[PDB]
Design a protein around this nucleic acid. Sequence first.
RNA 1: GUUUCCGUAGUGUAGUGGUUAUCACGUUCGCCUAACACGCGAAAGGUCCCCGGUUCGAAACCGGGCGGAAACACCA
RNA 2: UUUAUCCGGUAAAGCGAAUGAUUAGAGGUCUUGGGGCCGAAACGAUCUCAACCUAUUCUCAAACUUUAAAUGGGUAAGAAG
RNA 3: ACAGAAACCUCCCGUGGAGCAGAAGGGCAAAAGCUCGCUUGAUCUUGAUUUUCAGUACGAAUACAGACCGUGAAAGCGGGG
RNA 4: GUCUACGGCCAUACCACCCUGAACGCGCCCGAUCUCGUCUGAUCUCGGAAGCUAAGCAGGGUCGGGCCUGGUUAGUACUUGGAUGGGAGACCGCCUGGGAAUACCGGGUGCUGUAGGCUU
Lengths: 159, 75, 170, 292, 213
Amino acid sequence: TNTKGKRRGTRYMFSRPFRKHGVVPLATYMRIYKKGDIVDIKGMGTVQKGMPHKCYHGKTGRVYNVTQHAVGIVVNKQVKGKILAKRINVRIEHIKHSKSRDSFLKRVKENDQKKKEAKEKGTWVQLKRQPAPPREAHFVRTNGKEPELLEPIPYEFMA
Amino acid sequence: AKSKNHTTHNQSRKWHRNGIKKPRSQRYESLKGVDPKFLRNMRFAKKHNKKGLKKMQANNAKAMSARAEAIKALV
Amino acid sequence: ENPMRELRIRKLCLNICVGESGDRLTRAAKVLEQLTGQTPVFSKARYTVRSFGIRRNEKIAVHCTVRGAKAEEILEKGLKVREYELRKNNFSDTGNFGFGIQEHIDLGIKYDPSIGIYGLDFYVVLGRPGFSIADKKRRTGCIGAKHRISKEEAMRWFQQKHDGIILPGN
Amino acid sequence: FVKVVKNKAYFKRYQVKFRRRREGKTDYYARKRLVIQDKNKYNTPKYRMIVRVTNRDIICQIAYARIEGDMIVCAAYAHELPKYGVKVGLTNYAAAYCTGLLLARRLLNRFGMDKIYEGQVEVTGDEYNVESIDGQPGAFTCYLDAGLARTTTGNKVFGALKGAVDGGLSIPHSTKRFPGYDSESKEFNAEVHRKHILGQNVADYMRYLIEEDEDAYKKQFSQYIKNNVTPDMMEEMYKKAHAAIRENPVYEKKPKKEVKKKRWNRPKMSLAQKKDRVAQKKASFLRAQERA
Amino acid sequence: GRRPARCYRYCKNKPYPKSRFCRGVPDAKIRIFDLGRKKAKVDEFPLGGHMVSDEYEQLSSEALEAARICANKYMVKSCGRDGFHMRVRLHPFHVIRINKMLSCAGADRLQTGMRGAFGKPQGTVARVHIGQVIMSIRTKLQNEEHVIEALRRAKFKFPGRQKIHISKKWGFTKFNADEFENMVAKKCLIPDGCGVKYVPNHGPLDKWRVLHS
RNA sequence: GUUUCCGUAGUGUAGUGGUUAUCACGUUCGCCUAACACGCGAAAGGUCCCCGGUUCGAAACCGGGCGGAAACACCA
RNA sequence: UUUAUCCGGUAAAGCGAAUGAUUAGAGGUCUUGGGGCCGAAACGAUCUCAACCUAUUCUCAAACUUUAAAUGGGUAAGAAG
RNA sequence: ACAGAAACCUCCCGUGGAGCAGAAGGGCAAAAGCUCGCUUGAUCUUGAUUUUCAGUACGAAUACAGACCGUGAAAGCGGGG
RNA sequence: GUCUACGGCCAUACCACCCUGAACGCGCCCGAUCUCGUCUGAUCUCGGAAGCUAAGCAGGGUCGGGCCUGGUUAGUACUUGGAUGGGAGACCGCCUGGGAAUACCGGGUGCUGUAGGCUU
Ligand SMILES: [Mg+2]
Ligand SMILES: [Mg+2]
Ligand SMILES: [Mg+2]
Ligand SMILES: [Mg+2]
Ligand SMILES: [Mg+2]
Ligand SMILES: [Mg+2]
Ligand SMILES: [Mg+2]
Ligand SMILES: [Mg+2]
Ligand SMILES: [Mg+2]
């Protein structure tokens, strides 16, 4: 049997990456979070107060609370089946803004724009994304060379 | 009388037979867990919305008649 | 011609190591007191050694740092006991130098049958204007590449202010 | 010989410090403590009053911290004080007052508040603490930033703070280290702050070092003998600045456009100009030593 | 003494290197990984003969022992005591274990069977991959056949199979042998006793100034 | 193989809690004796088994090993 | 499953990158030694072996790591916008 | 100077090779290390959440809020390590 | 062109040495009356303005070490799936997809934020 300890096996997880042991860069606690914002937890060794727990390391969740230097945040945690939407309290040093959201809200700001315009025209524009289509028959042109002849090369034991 | 000591063998089958359910989320989730100084204030904000309903109602008819004028000036 | 490369004394250090911790040390504290004019600090032991009779955090020596004008006045009246002559390996790689004396009465000091004869350790940290860059608090820095006092630059310092005869052979 | 400490491996594993600590300028712990705002606010800035008595001039400036680099809302230097009749001694504790007084008034004329919270007027050197006015805009608040100054009693950094507090800024300050605090009875004289604020620590030095000997005078302060400053006058130099600063604080920065734009830096040498310097040597080496 | 090499032939368990975590290891049997004239120069021994493994297996310390000796003996011979250099390129590094021989006296009364099955160190063993070299010899280009036969005899002290191969390098370096003389004059390569130092167009110019001077 | 116990002067053995090392014998030198004993005075002698760690400091406190010893290996 | 986007320290790799092992020579009175041989002795000469280190080289690590996959885990792809 | 591989003093190099009561593992440099001065946030009081998990306790922990304070120019930090 | 004050990302910024810095500043620097601190005005605190770019700092320079990025190593090592494929076995080949790391070669060497200067 193994030990239930809160920081078991994190020997390699919470470890500051490389050539970064030291002062936390001050930007990381001067960006703002407000309820609704989506956040990806990523623990960190230097700050021990308010750490998450290793099963949330790498997970995302939205924000529901904001205290003086921590953020209440709801993530999903799968347990033997049933997924429990549970809310944890994590100090800011272990948190980033997830740009996972931000591809859309840029497809949105552009979709809303491309619909307000081209509405004075009435021309229906492709608003939906659409997966990578078949590559659309074209030409190839060799100019004045035949292709280069390739031959499988004779084996020889290198060692 | 030795026995098997553990396994997660067909467990994936079992808890996926009723199809692991992402927790059904409604709008308007509970405020339980938010810091008291927020609520202890936002309840006073909510409790006295009505004191100041006269401003809200007349100022609503102002924009309602200014945009009944904006949609009629278009006509 | 050198604007300010005036090789001058930054400090003069005195040390009386007497691994005895009490009398023979409380009396040696008046020697540097009388000779300099400033209360000397009591040093203590780094850790215990058996064969020497010293214990951890037990007081061993008493030392002093004299700078400014009174540092030239004890470096002078220092040598002239060694009669203005030193050895090649006293001028270190870093531009300092040091000479021990054997008896503290030959420095113009009154001898008592109680207050015995403890020689001391003269060491002299040569400097140059702009050396406190290392020691300050805001915006510290390293002292260039030149502007550092070499073993040979500190040699002919002493050959040109106290006219030493610095003698070769270990 | 020895083992070479600075190996190839020393530099491969060596992680540099944060730059502003290489230059030895920034205490970021005590900047993390000072600057970051609580996330019950999420946008409202946290102002600091910065004072860096340099070597010759006392800089004052108020800043909040953004993520691109803290922006400066208002800066007031000590080398602008000659406009208000202070010619000399502008790294001295008396002048850090006028700098911090200027800074406070030049900040309070924007946001239209120069007509309220003027703070102490004449001068006392006592406990003053602006109390925001009901029905009016709340008083301005910031927190003194000492930087790297060992803040023992009398040090000008939080002595320039007394200038801002007298100007109308609500900065939480004690008096435990204002010049005048008696570190053996734990109280105030408050008439020692009288002198130090108006320069009588420099006047009474200017009066001991006149009767005792000359030529120490005129070497300790020549530009105080030149420019026709004297004792019995210094107190009535800063008492005019304290009034002249507070009637017009606004800056009128001098216009600037003349420069012909020459380059007396030295440019970076291109690739091929290094690439031939070798092969410009090694033809001077070869040719030379294939003779003798 | 020791179980036959059968039981410890395959690489089953993760490497068990001698460290603070296993101790009391009996010192490896093979000790001297190179003999002959290891005081040779690169300029006088141009024949990199190899003995390359063809199977992913283990080699006992005592096997590398006999394989070296029996090659020292068909060498200094036809070659002479000076005319070669032999390298063993597998240091027995991984520690092999033995449950404690299930020792019993008489018929028996008890042994506990498997409780604490974990056993003691018994010896050491080399890990070998396909296409990885075991032994390498270098002599004069004159003496090729005697490298082939000296390595051919060492195969018979080894389990599994291994091909004998003559390298295109010069002696023990990494440099293709058709190119050595060219990279020696003009000094892309500088003799360094056995090996050789590849000097690039990288360093300070004075480092050159020594050469071509 | 499992579980215990020790190692200290030439020898057998004390000893402490982490600041010191004993006793007895042996031995060396004198003294008595005609000469040995006996007796009386003085003497010199051990990394405190080999190790690494903890500690201000280990002979003594831990961990490993080496040597000498003791106690279990029952139901068929 | 795509499209974005974070998370990861396993296989492999590396050890002329840390830690830990480890072979060889060249280089070094580095230091120093313990033996020598030629020396009264002498960093004198020549060796030698030890330990270190200056460029190198052979081979390794489950309780080592500069690097670093594959499979894989989060979210997000709107009207509760 | 006595002083030797070790006492004491001085300069230079020193990314951490030390230290952080203990096992290891992480973390740490005008620090979390060492030295001083002032102290009792190791105090009183509701809830919320994390950790083992049935998503029960106990233990331990994380964010708050309300009091009384300690400290510091202050921002802050502190309800054991 | 550049600096000073406060910075962000934290080596393309470090380190080693070499050369050049007009004016503003930054500094070295000169003193201990007061404030404050020391065994020592050495550091810290304070009053200064006689000197100098000697150094820090800035700017460059090095077939420089380091880092940052590309190429190669290599479609190699490894791997998701697949077969009544091979092999006594170790292991190996192919199909369907993904795809690294050194040594070895190149290129680069701090970008900027706000507020103030100087080159008027
Ligand atoms: Mg069974
Ligand atoms: Mg501070
Ligand atoms: Mg793992
Ligand atoms: Mg509280
Ligand atoms: Mg603590
Ligand atoms: Mg001075
Ligand atoms: Mg300069
Ligand atoms: Mg210069
Ligand atoms: Mg380079």
